[model samples]
Target: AAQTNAPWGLARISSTSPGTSTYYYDESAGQGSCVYVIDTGIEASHPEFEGRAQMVKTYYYSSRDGNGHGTHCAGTVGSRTYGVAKKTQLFGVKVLDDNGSGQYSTIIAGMDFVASDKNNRNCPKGVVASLSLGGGYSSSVNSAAARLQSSGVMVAVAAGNNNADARNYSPASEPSVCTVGASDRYDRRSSFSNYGSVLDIFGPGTDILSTWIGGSTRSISGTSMATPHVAGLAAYLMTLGKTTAASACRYIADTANKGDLSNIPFGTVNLLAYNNYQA
Candidate 1:
């Protein structure tokens, strides 16, 4: 996978130099924001996430940590400095346990939790839900996600990492969800990133460096990492008062850097033009 340049000087922040400003631009974007991470729990003590990542809600389907997959995904979406949406609040829902496997019922129950706020009021106004896991589409799951969407929550999911057809995945292939694919530094699809007409956008997912368990950091490769980039961008747009999900989606898609659509797949996301437009 190619390397995607980090906007707002993330490389500079990630450097190991003394007194190197390890924070994103002090802009209003993502400040006082909230996003629900329906995956593994995050390491709340990471330096980059010191005062950020409000774990307002937590539900664990699995008790063990599976190769730190969930933690990694959490950091990508909410880790301070390293995360695209550092200042945003995070709601951790452990639908997959230590083995990185979970049943459909467990996943649906988690979504139901989000839709109904049954356990808590953590999911307040101006919150986006990020899902890094997905199975094949099920009417049950789609209906649940639709309910969440109708309740003013923006949902984003990874377009699977199988490098196969996206139709192979569920919620990602659903119309109610914003399906995200992985892209390299050159904005090309990753070899392992699934592509199809269902994909809504692309983000930097190749070799993404983020927080890990026990205050560690490492680079991961997947569309799961990319999905949060969009999530963070959405949070930033929301901070600028772009409340509705449709408005944020339009802003991202319209502002991305445009080109001969041929460089991307048939259903590839046009994020380049969207990013450019925002700048």
Candidate 2:
């Protein structure tokens, strides 16, 4: 059975303005795209994945997510029910630990791994690196992310939960990466979401329900959660032939719902992410 009641986030993205809520997406929107979820390991056996998600690489000791953050983020990116790119294949590239913590070395290694495996996908519509994690600005992290982007992977990163300028973050501040902030159901900036001129777009983040560890569901909020929405959107766009990361980023920002967000910081862009949905 098709899901009748859509997630508020999903419903919001399909609308041109924030009024009524419903979901309208093409069946083949992300059919051949690949999204690498760069975070904590995912719960691969979660029913929401229907076996479409796999653990491709892990920097942590176990490939399973002891913490639920990674699974939830992956679910938002491409699970069966809570996804932006429902048909896209998902790969868990675990860089964070069960505590949801990681170092720059591990993070850079993960990016390099994605760069090496960039070509190991189904088709060349595009490959995405969905990074729902970030830290203080580091030139090394920025360089690695740029390297991944240059290797032909669409990189979508979180703006951070600090409620401060995102320009102070690592991958989020990296110019080549698509940095995303958080929006609420009313299309207002989330209180904890980092915002700045560096932020590329906003996505529904508050009270988002998605798959979690132990095959359960959880609702949480963060710019971390917002990032994968844009990542999945990039995947969706790629299947539509936005082949390059730059092109996909441009399409998402250019075709987004404009000037609808409220309570955003001075430097934050007012564009809200849209899925190119039509009714």
Candidate 3:
């Protein structure tokens, strides 16, 4: 069964501009591509997701379904109609487990798996890695992320959902990583979304609709929901033939709709333009 409407549905409408039908029209009509979703495993059998979703790998660092956070995040990012990159392949890395929390070592291990790409034997050599989770920024984590990026992996992390400055948070605050902030249906920054000069771009995060356990659908809110929108857009840019992270980021910043949000911080970012620039 397909959902008629939801918050993510509304966000998708704004994302596609003309409407959901027109947005999906581009996805269905566009060439098929793949991106790695380093989150909880997706419900592969969902009606809207069936046959359209592919799981290249899985790593359960935390309990399988502790708080349903990963499941909800996965559904919002890769769910059929609601997802920005519906036709893209998902690489499930359950670093948080069911409890919604995991050790930093476990998180690193999951990232290692995606960086290896050996797990993706069934698909192409390199796929974009979508990371919608992160804690406070760490120099060690930044180094690790940089190593992965050097290996030709694009990492997209959520700027923490806290309303504080973006100077915090690992991976997201990393220089090489694309730090994603949250926006509302009107493309305004959510009151709770973190912002800073390092922040990369904004995406729909408020009232996101996604799949739940036992084949259900619901709306969840957070920067986690917004992170994947950028990840999916990155995939679309990849499909358009921008292979590197710099190029992908440039494409997104150029293509995104810039808006004026009164609550946005001083260093708030709307997009990163990359035309006639070297990658």
Candidate 4:
């Protein structure tokens, strides 16, 4: 169900003497916590998923993953070897569609579902929502995510792939959410990732390898890819008993400022994902 060896991404995070590179240990697969992917629904049958995800779709009733984006994001969030937290539950909820797009209203509805804490057969669990999708600013989307955050679910949002100011975007500009930008392996910001004071952090987003449809893996890039690193890491922190969204967000943001990354802006560097965290 897991890979024979860890991916480079894992090793990068787990390194002890990371130098200019970001590094940290894979504490556990988000054990005792759940990381919810609010995106294109995941194909639960995919070996990487290993039938572990509690799956659902909001675009329609059918379970589908015509777009491989959600699955790949899921892999980095909780896949055995690729994940920052290996054992965390993979909770998949779809808002996008076959064309890789969706209405903000649909996304808000999906957020409502996650906040509701019902898993088909049960009540809700304290959850971390991994959102890799966002568009322009919207008061509706902003209030929805803010309210959901207050509902006790930790939320992570993409800083956007447009390379423009993130504050100009929705969810990304939401102060309550962990707004993530993209960074290359070299610790430099991804060319296409948005930047601004509103951005909360940066994660490995370039040439990332993760699960795909039809039981496979692929390399992709964008803030979309970067967002999951924080999501998985957030769940991993949750496993450590951070317990609350503010607590988890605080630890992540504080530690990332410790060693810091190479060549990143001061404001953003302090916000990048840390190579390691003590607690």
Candidate 5:
């Protein structure tokens, strides 16, 4: 069955243009895959997870999504109804606190945990890490994220919401991660989204509806929201044997809907995330 009245973000990816009311995804797109959301953490009890979301590690305040950022990102990453990869296992690595803030050391610790976990499990189905947080360029966090990708984890990061060049942001600026920008419902680059040559691709981000804290759902906007859509897509592609981070990233870029968005900055890539499930 197709998702009727689907979130624009989901519907947009499955179609070439906007105003598509149904989201058609492969029923088994993300089966056997795993996505780690490295932010404020996730509410595992949310019905959208279907028991597949869990708090795998915590480097900040408790293993709960007090800020709701991580939960929202996780929902887009793999919720049963609001997700891109509905069947992927969701793991929360609590690096940010309830205020949506964290130290570089804490964030690095979360990435460290993801690398260690992926190594330990010898993840056969591939692993993806969604990072929706960032700051000024930091070698520590950038190197940590790079090492995480080198460890075979497909990493997706927000290109920041500063409305400036994304080359100024860490992790997003790091060439090793998939730095995602935001596109609105009209297929225009979001005014507040960071751009520049550092960006890998764009995703539906403005007014995105997804699971939130306390088992509720909400609409929000940011490149933060955009990043997970790519992560989810990466997880889905990984199930098709694009297991290595480099291959999956290349596949995502190669398969994206190119030159379809407007208002893209001069240096930013014109690619928009696509799942190739058009109907």
Candidate 6:
């Protein structure tokens, strides 16, 4: 079934805290904040977006989103109804291709591009880089993610879908990054989500309905689906100037609805990832 913008995920995200029955919608929503989606590419003209995004192609393959993954991820991070910070500027940094596959160099290049342009583009508050793609460990890719963090760009990476340890993947296992896992609408961790000490938080990922490439909406699974949840929060945090990435990461982890999730462990408590934010 299509979400038809049912908003279960958004509602679940907001109600994590006590007595909040609605999203913490902010008027300062995403103002002056930008999230660079380092994915396939976005369908900028999709009705859900309501505006054209800045597309910085890493290569010719990056110019278009034949694969819907990038566009789907973009929608989750900033679509009007499907997103957290609706007004946050979405920058499509296409590194992956139609098959959602890319070389290691391409991944690094995408991160560098965002960090390099962040300040120069006058988004001096810096930007957040959201990557829903990851695999076997790659030093170069993890290094690029670390540098992005050093440059004040918060990096939100997927914990991977293999159900294996996230520490085995690039960027996700890297230091100073916000690695994310997935949870379902039931607030249970998705069976496919990778879990480990490296993971920072979890969010709705299972059967999550969001804007798609063909001006429609889709529901995708995996930790990939869970990643944008954290990214959206990062964008909102940056826009609020709440604090640095380090502090923001800590804030989110600390404030999350704790000891409520089932299954595996994060130290002693097994917690589901959660978020609630606004001006």
Error at 166, model 4, angstroms: 0.3
Better of 4 and 6 by TM-score: 6
Model 1, 1-279: lDDT tens digits are 111354322432222221233333335546666777777656555676766654434446433334466667667666754666566776667777766677888888888777666234543337778888887767777777777777777788888988887876777877767778876655567778888888777766777777777778888888888787777777766766755665565566665545423256655555531322111
Which sections of candidate 6 miss by over 4 Å?
1-6, 17-22, 266-279
User: Which is the winner by lDDT between candidate 3 and candidate 4?
Assistant: 4
Q: Best candidate, lDDT-wise?
A: 5
Question: Tens digit of lDDT per residue, candidate 2, span 1-279?
Answer: 124577888888888766555677877768788899989888999988888899989987789899899999999999988998888888988899999999999999999998887666675677888898889999999999999988888899999999899889998899988889999988789999998898889998999989999889989999888888899888888887754676788788989999999997776799999976654
Query: How does candidate 1 score on lDDT?
Result: 0.65
Per-residue alpha-carbon lDDT of candidate 5 for residues 140-257, written as tens digits (9 for 90 to 100) = 8899989998888899999999999988888888998889999999999998999998888899899999999989999999999999999999998888675466678778888889
CA RMSD of all predictions: 5.6, 1.5, 4.8, 3.2, 1.3, 3.3
Model 4 lDDT tens row, 1-279: 233356555554544333333334545556667778998988778776666776855567566888899888998887764666777778789898867799988999998888875344331334788899999999889888887788877889999988788888988999888889887766667888888887877777888888898888889998988888888888776666654665666677776744445555545544567546543
TM-score of each: 0.82, 0.96, 0.82, 0.88, 0.97, 0.91
Model 1 ranges with Cα > 4 A deviation: 1-26, 54-67, 118-125, 260-263, 273-279
- Model 2 has a clash total of 0
Task: Give the candidate order by descending lDDT.
Answer: 5, 2, 6, 4, 1, 3
Candidate 5: RMSD over Cα atoms? Answer: 1.3
Q: Which 10 successive residues of model 4 have the least lDDT summed?
A: 14-23
What number of backbone clashes does candidate 4 have, counting pairs of residues 3 or more apart or in separate chains? 10
What C-alpha lDDT do the candidate models reach, one value each?
0.65, 0.87, 0.63, 0.75, 0.89, 0.77
The local lDDT score (0 to 100) that residue 103 gets in candidate 1 is 82
Model 6, 1-279: lDDT tens per residue?
112334666666666542233565556666677888998899998887888376876565348888899988988888987887687888898899888998888888888888888876656454778899998998888899999988888788998988888888988889688888887766677888888888888877888778887788888787777788778877777777775665666777876777656666555235444545433
